[PDB]
């Protein structure tokens, strides 16, 4: 069937849309080529609609069925709990889209009678009506990028807030626990950046002759078929579940997940969806299961040897045993045809890699540096282009989500995050005296409230003390960074070193947590380094839950 059907009504915006980076003294200090940074808007919607609209091809074989049974057998060991309205309400982001039924996210979090009453009626409707399609709003997503030698906006589809709260009640525990139980070490969201690096490295070193490849599926969500969504549900149904939960999952699958009507911001019928909606609770879990299922079966079909997979939603990386140069290439080609038959056609043609560092997965790659003792240490890094473009943007325009805080946390050990992100943002937080003001950011799709002054401990817990002493980065990494800066008009690293010294000093002067930031975060700036010892409060942080599952588009907030 067609992934989408359009009536012709436009995908409209529900407010003005900013698309250019403002000329701002603060952002200009970070990146000068402001015309190279842009944000996607609804104006490019019709271009994305054209790319995601096509008839799907799907042929299932024995390998597929064998893998499905193996997964369901593992899903059988799970017992998921039904969440109370209260718990589900507490999981709602303070700035989540307001309902069209007289209440907003604040009301849901406060458990106001109106919100809670409407939520119950939605739940009860789910238990009674097993077929009426549920409404969804389709919007053009606003994302920031750097021009290329442009990207059309992504399309986000989501149901009303009442429904989103009901999804949590029935499936929050499921999508938070089942992936791991079914996929084991192959489930990516269970790892922190350091654990992910450890898994990829260990997996690589375990092969007699490693060969790896990332596999980019062409617009994954639109490739998910009705059969994929029912197969996915047949997996969830193996969990021990409360009666109402089992029914809510059954109704939600047929009324929301397999597809439904699309309505624009103006209230006009835009068309219909018969594929994965990006904004429902099961998108991340469902995509990871679907991708893992097809890929695992595809490997057997292609005769790839000892396939180890790491999956995060639609992002897939595979590490296996080489059978020779020509053999690997032929087998990779058969792998791709197998996925295509499963309705997971390729975007960028996959290529076999024999150098672990040359493999990009989840937009990142493993690289190497050295700690104080001179010992080698693997860490996760990426092309800083997008992070830098977004940092500039978030500096000139106040944004709800601060990707820079999240990039600092996730890429703390990198050359660019240390010399540029930490320096730029701490310098600004000092100038405006807002070092103690908590900010919102996202980790694996989940929204978190974080205080900048807690970065030292957080970084220590997630990456270890070595994140504050890495030096002697690799030539390729250093060159990718420098090259990136020249392209975007970002002052050269030498300049950032100089700015860092001034920042560090100011931080120490203030003492307290502020001084701790100067000591650990900017120890790389001074030539006469300090002895960095374990931070007290670090071994006490409750980082339980930060890396459990993916919640992209799941409207999740963790307090």
Ligand X SMILES: Cc1cc(NS(=O)(=O)c2cc(Cl)c(Cl)cc2Cl)no1
* Shortest Å, Cβ 481 to ligand X: 7
Task: Specify the pairing of strand 439-443 against strand 446-450.
Answer: antiparallel
Torsion of CA 433, 434, 436, 441, to 10 degrees: -160
* Shortest Å, Cβ 290 to ligand X: 15
**92 with 555: CB under 8 angstroms?**
yes
Question: Closer CB to ligand X, residue 290 or residue 312?
Answer: 312
- Binding-site entries for Mg(2+): 216, 314-315
* Shortest Å, Cβ 402 to ligand X: 10
Question: Closer CB to ligand X, residue 229 or residue 443?
Answer: 443
Residue 314 DSSP one-character state: T
| Whole-number Å distance between alpha carbons of 52 and 3 | 7
As given in the structure block, the two tokens for residue 493 are 């690293």
**248 with 126: CB under 8 angstroms?**
yes
Q: Count the Cβ atoms, other than its own, within 10 Å of residue 542.
A: 7
Question: Closer CB to ligand X, residue 352 or residue 445?
Answer: 445
* Shortest Å, Cβ 362 to ligand X: 3
Among 173, 157, 168, 172, residue whose Cα is nearest residue 122: 168
* Shortest Å, Cβ 27 to ligand X: 20
The residue with tokens 């499936």 is 171
| Whole-number Å distance between alpha carbons of 39 and 17 | 9
Torsion of CA 383, 384, 390, 392, to 10 degrees: -150
Q: Exposed e or buried b for every residue in 84-111, given b needs 16+ CB within 10 A?
A: ebeebbbbbbeebbebeeebbbebbbee
* Shortest Å, Cβ 152 to ligand X: 20
The residue with tokens 């939603």 is 313
Residues in contact with ligand X by CB under 6 A are 193, 196, 312, 315, 362, 364, 380, 406-407, 410, 415, 418-419, 442-444, 471, 473, 478, 493-494, 497, 524
As given in the structure block, the two tokens for residue 139 are 């919007």
Question: Closer CB to ligand X, residue 4 or residue 220?
Answer: 220
Overall residue count recorded for the chain in this entry: 559
Q: Count the Cβ atoms, other than its own, within 10 Å of residue 191.
A: 19
- Binding-site entries: 216, 314-315
* Shortest Å, Cβ 468 to ligand X: 9
Question: Closer CB to ligand X, residue 438 or residue 493?
Answer: 493
| Whole-number Å distance between alpha carbons of 514 and 547 | 27
Find the distance separating the first CA and the last CA of the chain, reported in whole Å. Answer: 41
Question: Closer CB to ligand X, residue 68 or residue 317?
Answer: 317
**516 with 413: CB under 8 angstroms?**
no
| Whole-number Å distance between alpha carbons of 190 and 488 | 34
* Shortest Å, Cβ 469 to ligand X: 9
Among 345, 124, 142, residue whose Cα is nearest residue 244: 124
Question: Closer CB to ligand X, residue 64 or residue 199?
Answer: 199
**418 with 412: CB under 8 angstroms?**
yes
Question: Closer CB to ligand X, residue 144 or residue 410?
Answer: 410
Question: Closer CB to ligand X, residue 172 or residue 416?
Answer: 416
* Shortest Å, Cβ 419 to ligand X: 5
């Amino acid at each position: 069937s067609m992934s989408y059907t359009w009536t012709g009504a436009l995908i409209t915006p529900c407010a003005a849309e900013e698309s250019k980076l403002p000329i701002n003294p603060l952002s200009n200090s970070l990146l000068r080529h402001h015309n190279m940074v842009y944000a996607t808007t609804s104006r490019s919607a019709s271009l994305r609609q054209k790319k995601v609209t096509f008839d799907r091809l799907q042929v299932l074989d024995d390998h597929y069925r064998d893998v499905l049974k193996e997964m369901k057998a593992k899903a059988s060991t799970v017992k998921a709990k039904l969440l109370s309205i209260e718990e589900a309400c507490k999981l709602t982001p303070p700035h989540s889209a307001k309902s069209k039924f007289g209440y907003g996210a604040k009301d849901v979090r406060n458990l106001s009678s109106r919100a809670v009453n409407h939520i119950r009626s939605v739940w009860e409707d789910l238990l009674e009506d097993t077929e009426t399609p549920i409404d969804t709003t389709i919007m053009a997503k606003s994302e920031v990028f750097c021009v290329q030698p442009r990207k059309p906006a992504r399309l986000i589809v989501f149901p009303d807030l009442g429904v989103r709260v009901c999804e949590k009640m029935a499936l929050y525990d499921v999508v938070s626990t089942l992936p791991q139980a079914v996929m084991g070490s192959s489930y990516g969201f269970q790892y922190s950046p350091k654990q992910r690096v450890e898994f990829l490295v260990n997996t690589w070193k375990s092969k007699k002759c490693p060969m790896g490849f990332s596999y980019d599926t062409r617009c994954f969500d639109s490739t998910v078929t009705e059969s994929d969504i029912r197969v996915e549900e047949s997996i969830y149904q193996c969990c021990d579940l409360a009666p109402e939960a089992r029914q809510a999952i059954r109704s939600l699958t047929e009324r929301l997940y397999i597809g439904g009507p699309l309505t624009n911001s103006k209230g006009q019928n835009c068309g219909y969806r018969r594929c994965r909606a990006s904004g429902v609770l099961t998108t991340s879990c469902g995509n990871t299961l679907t991708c893992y299922l097809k890929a695992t079966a595809a490997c057997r079909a292609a005769k790839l040897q000892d396939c180890t997979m790491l999956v995060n939603g639609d992002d897939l990386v595979v590490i296996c045993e080489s059978a020779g140069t020509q053999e690997d290439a032929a087998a990779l080609r058969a792998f791709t045809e197998a996925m295509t038959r499963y309705s997971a056609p390729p975007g960028d043609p996959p290529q076999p890699e024999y150098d672990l560092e040359l493999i990009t997965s989840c937009s990142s790659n493993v690289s190497v540096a050295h700690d104080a003792s001179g010992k080698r240490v693997y860490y996760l890094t990426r092309d800083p282009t997008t992070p830098l473009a977004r940092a500039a943007w978030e500096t000139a325009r106040h944004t709800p989500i601060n990707s820079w805080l999240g990039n600092i946390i996730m890429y703390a050990p990198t050359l660019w995050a240390r010399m540029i992100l930490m320096t730029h943002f701490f310098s600004i937080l000092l100038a405006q005296e807002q070092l103690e003001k908590a900010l919102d950011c996202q980790i694996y799709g989940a929204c978190y409230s974080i205080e900048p002054l807690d970065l030292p401990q957080i970084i220590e817990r997630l990456h270890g003390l070595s994140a504050f002493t890495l030096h002697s980065y690799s030539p390729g990494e250093i060159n990718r960074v420098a090259s990136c800066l020249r392209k975007l008009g970002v002052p050269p690293l030498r300049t950032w070193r100089h700015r860092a010294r001034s920042v560090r000093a100011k931080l120490l002067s203030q003492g307290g947590r502020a001084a701790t930031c100067g000591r650990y975060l900017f120890n790389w700036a001074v030539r006469t380094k300090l002895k960095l010892t374990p931070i007290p409060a670090a071994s006490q942080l409750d980082l339980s839950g930060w890396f459990v599952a993916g919640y992209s588009g799941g409207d999740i907030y963790h307090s």
